[PDB]
Design a protein around this ligand. Structure first.
Ligand SMILES: CC(=O)N[C@@H]1[C@H](O[C@H]2[C@@H](O)[C@@H](CO)O[C@H](O)[C@@H]2NC(C)=O)O[C@H](C(=O)O)[C@@H](O[C@H]2O[C@H](CO)[C@H](O)[C@H](O)[C@H]2NC(C)=O)[C@@H]1NC(C)=O
Ligand SMILES: CC(=O)N[C@@H]1[C@H](NC(C)=O)[C@H](O)O[C@H](C(=O)O)[C@H]1OC(C)=O
Lengths: 232, 210
């Protein structure tokens, strides 16, 4: 997050590109400040005229640039009031461009995760594989795949919600690597059988808490017709 | 089997089971053409000990007899004692499938439809979805008689009932089938007071018992 000499307050990515700006260019001597009212504004050289504002209210709050990517203004209670949205979704290597990855099930029973990195022209390059495991390691019959930054690294991670033959459930997480690949999945959460069922869960990834780390929400459909939203 | 005189031939047996296997008291049967081979056959919703539901199908032999059954659908999420299965082609596939009318403890009821499909060469019923539902106390499953068929002639089977109302009135309702096997709202038909038509004194002609 930088304020340019030309008065334009901007946020740039690791790709060197600008993701967001106030557009207050040409106002040389302009300054950006965070007021006691809790808002973030850009003021002209005269120290009086406002050129841009987030128009928020949050006394005792603060403006924080997160490692996840974007700039968020938070109140005294730690609740987000406003965000620039300057983030790149599922950027696995942290190079400033979104990527995509897939779980590939081979006919011989083994599986691996393949990553397609984004190019400078918006195209997707040839996949590389990581976490290639032997047959019999995963029983890939009843599992759901999620993406997102679950560590607050600044680079995307992945997760798998899987049911087991004993009706138990586990949620696996694999951290993104700088090379665009993934590390081994580890259990991030688990429950004894009789708690949650894979056939009813409909997980969603995203930052629902606003704490700077992605998390998981589930639209759980009960056998009796009732519905509840669960948050992890 | 039937002759061209409208008469029936002598009965012959085909499929059979030893004593201690299939219990008649746990069998709720429906019939229809579930794989579209041009022959109607049987399916059984069996009460599996703990009142879970396991559905068997008994494909018809070319000679009119029946072959060894196989399981097409099973669920432990629903109580067998509260299920009343019905058969018909509810999406116009050309092959019949089944729905289950379920009487909830809450006083409400619903119909779950399981469409017939073939996946990886294997015939089975697909995942159940709710196609009809009512408020609690709106319908009593023990006070109405069910019969399926294609009532508007649009090629998709649907169901209609004669229900006995609290005031003794008998009313016809029909729920037509949408292309996605979802049901429409019930459409009222003929009705009468108990002084004309007595509910408990009439039985409908059906294709399968209860
Ligand atoms: C036969 C059936 O209805 N199975 C249930 C469920 O069916 C769906 C569902 O899995 C969705 C989403 O994953 O994908 C398809 O639509 C499935 N449909 C068919 C026709 O297969 O599948 C789950 C499932 O976990 O696949 C069943 O639960 C069973 O499988 C788990 C995981 O392997 C485990 O083996 C359980 O022991 C086994 N559970 C039970 C209770 O037998 C669903 N089963 C029920 C009863 O609802
Ligand atoms: C029993 C009866 O009359 N049912 C009507 C029918 N629904 C069902 C489930 O059969 C339709 O919707 C009506 C409505 O809800 O307008 C129901 O009427 C009432 C009076 O609730």
């Amino acid at each position: 997050l930088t304020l340019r000499a030309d008065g334009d307050l901007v946020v740039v990515s690791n790709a060197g590109k600008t993701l967001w700006s106030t557009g207050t260019a040409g106002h040389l001597g302009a300054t950006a400040r965070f007021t006691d009212s809790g808002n973030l504004t850009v003021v002209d050289a005269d120290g009086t005229t406002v050129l841009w504002e987030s128009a928020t209210t949050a006394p005792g709050g603060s403006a924080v640039l997160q490692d996840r990517g974007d700039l968020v203004v938070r109140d005294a209670q730690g609740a987000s009031q406003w965000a620039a949205g300057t983030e790149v979704r599922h950027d696995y290597n942290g190079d400033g461009r979104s990527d995509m990855a897939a779980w590939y099930n081979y006919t011989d029973g083994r599986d691996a995760i393949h990553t397609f990195l984004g190019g400078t022209d918006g195209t997707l390059t040839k996949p590389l594989k990581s976490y290639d495991v032997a047959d019999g390691v995963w029983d890939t019959r009843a599992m759901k795949y999620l993406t997102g930054d679950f560590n607050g690294d600044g680079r995307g991670d992945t997760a798998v919600l899987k049911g087991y033959s004993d009706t138990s459930v586990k949620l696996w997480v694999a951290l993104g690597r700088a090379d665009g690949g993934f590390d081994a999945p580890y259990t991030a959460w688990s429950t004894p059988a009789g708690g949650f069922h894979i056939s009813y869960m409909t997980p969603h990834a995203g930052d629902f808490n606003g704490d700077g780390r992605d998390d998981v929400a589930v639209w759980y459909a009960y056998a009796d017709g009732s519905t509840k939203l669960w948050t992890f | 089997t039937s002759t061209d005189r409208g008469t029936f031939n002598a009965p012959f047996s085909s499929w059979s089971a030893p004593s201690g296997s299939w219990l008649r008291s746990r069998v709720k049967s429906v019939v229809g053409d579930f794989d579209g081979d041009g022959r109607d056959d049987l399916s059984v919703f069996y009460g599996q000990g703990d009142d879970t539901v396991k559905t068997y199908v008994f494909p018809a032999a070319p000679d009119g007899g029946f072959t060894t059954p196989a399981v097409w659908w099973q669920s432990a999420s629903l109580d067998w004692n509260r299920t009343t299965p019905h058969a018909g082609d509810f999406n116009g596939d050309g092959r019949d499938d089944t729905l289950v009318w379920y009487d909830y403890p809450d006083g409400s009821d619903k119909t779950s439809t399981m469409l017939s499909e073939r996946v990886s060469g294997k015939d089975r019923f697909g995942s159940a979805k709710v196609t009809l539902s009512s408020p609690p106390g709106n319908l009593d499953v023990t006070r109405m008689q069910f019969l399926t068929g294609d009532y508007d002639g649009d090629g998709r089977d649907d169901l209609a009932t004669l229900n006995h109302q609290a005031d003794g009135t008998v009313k016809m309702w029909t729920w037509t089938a949408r292309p996605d096997a979802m049901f429409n709202g019930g459409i009222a038909g003929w009705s009468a007071p108990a002084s004309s038509w007595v509910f408990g004194s009439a039985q409908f002609f059906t294709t399968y018992p209860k």
